[PDB]
Amino acid sequence: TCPFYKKIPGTGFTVDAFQYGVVEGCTAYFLTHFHSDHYAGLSKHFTFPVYCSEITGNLLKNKLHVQEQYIHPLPLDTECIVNGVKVVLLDANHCPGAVMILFYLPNGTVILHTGDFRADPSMERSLLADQKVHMLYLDTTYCSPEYTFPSQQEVIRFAINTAFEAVTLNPHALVVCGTYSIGKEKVFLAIADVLGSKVGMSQEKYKTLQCLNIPEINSLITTDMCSSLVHLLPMMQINFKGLQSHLKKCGGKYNQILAFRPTGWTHSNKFTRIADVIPQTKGNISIYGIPYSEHSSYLEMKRFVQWLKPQKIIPTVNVGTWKSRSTMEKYFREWKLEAGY
Numbered sequence: 001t002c003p004f005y006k007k008i009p010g011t012g013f014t015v016d017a018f019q020y021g022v023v024e025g026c027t028a029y030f031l032t033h034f035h036s037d038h039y040a041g042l043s044k045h046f047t048f049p050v051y052c053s054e055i056t057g058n059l060l061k062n063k064l065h066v067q068e069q070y071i072h073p074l075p076l077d078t079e080c081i082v083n084g085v086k087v088v089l090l091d092a093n094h095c096p097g098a099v100m101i102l103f104y105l106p107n108g109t110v111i112l113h114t115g116d117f118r119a120d121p122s123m124e125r126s127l128l129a130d131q132k133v134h135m136l137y138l139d140t141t142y143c144s145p146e147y148t149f150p151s152q153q154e155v156i157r158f159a160i161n162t163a164f165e166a167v168t169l170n171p172h173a174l175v176v177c178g179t180y181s182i183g184k185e186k187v188f189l190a191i192a193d194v195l196g197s198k199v200g201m202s203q204e205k206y207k208t209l210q211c212l213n214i215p216e217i218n219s220l221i222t223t224d225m226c227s228s229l230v231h232l233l234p235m236m237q238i239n240f241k242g243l244q245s246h247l248k249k250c251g252g253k254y255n256q257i258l259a260f261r262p263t264g265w266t267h268s269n270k271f272t273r274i275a276d277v278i279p280q281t282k283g284n285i286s287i288y289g290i291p292y293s294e295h296s297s298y299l300e301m302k303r304f305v306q307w308l309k310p311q312k313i314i315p316t317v318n319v320g321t322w323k324s325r326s327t328m329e330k331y332f333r334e335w336k337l338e339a340g341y
């Protein structure tokens with residue numbers, strides 16, 4: 001049945017709740033972003049109002065064929081009225097089109113739902129600064145102190161420098177980058193830009209990217225793999241067997257592959273700095289796991305919450321085990337005692 005942490009009290013609303021059939025009492029279904037664990041359930045046969053960003057609405061129409069009459073895109077940073085309730089969509093610093101949602105309940109309670117987010121100090125200057133938030137529905141994906149990672153900027157500097165050095169030493173090397181969803185576009189686009197190439201990809205992935213309102217995108221991507229020396233493949237193909245096979249397909253144009261897997265966290269982070277990352281190599285194939293995250297680190301999450309000072313926190317991730325739930329609740333209490341709220 002629909003879990004309580006997907007329902008907004010005092011409303012008829014749900015968030016990211018498309019796989020439970022008709023949720024009893026739901027008058028508007030919000031969708032924070034286009035990732036499959038959140039949209040699971042949607043299709044051309046859905047006939048209730050879906051509220052989302054413009055970008056998410058482009059993906060719903062083009063990729064899932066949801067009918068236009070049921071898609072209600074809202075502008076960001078703008079007070080809107082939905083079924084009699086004031087709402088605002090904020091940038092979540094997650095994947096393209098991802099939002100946080102502020103609900104202003106008729107009784108005066110204010111609720112923020114983060115969806116999936118990567119907390120940032122820039123959020124401390126949005127419309128969130130303007131009033132008190134009472135209840136926080138929090139993306140707790142990496143809510144434990146072991147989870148550190150570098151800035152996105154540090155990670156892209158590493159990737160760009162590695163790629164440029166490799167291809168300048170060997171102009172016959174091919175760069176491959178893995179993907180299995182939207183998000184992390186900066187990895188492949190920044191590498192193609194330093195090399196003077198477009199990124200080559202499947203027709204399906206090209207279609208997906210053309211829904212994202214990225215500026216000048218026609219100049220950066222292509223379905224012509226032969227004209228490109230940065231290729232995008234499914235994340236499942238980023239292994240030695242899959243890469244050897246791909247190299248065969250390129251007909252002796254290339255003699256070396258340098259591949260990137262943008263993981264979330266991996267326990268090489270507890271020890272290793274970004275400067276010290278090394279690849280796995282077999283023959284003329286090397287594979288780099290880089291820690292490019294679109295979720296908050298522990299410290300980023302903690303700073304956001306201690307700034308916001310909510311009265312009640314409802315986790316939305318890692319809620320399936322009692323040990324995880326109890327650990328998170330202990331951190332929330334530490335944060336509150338340290339900060340004084």
Ligand code: NI
Nearest residue numbers: 033035094116
């Ligand atoms: Ni997500």
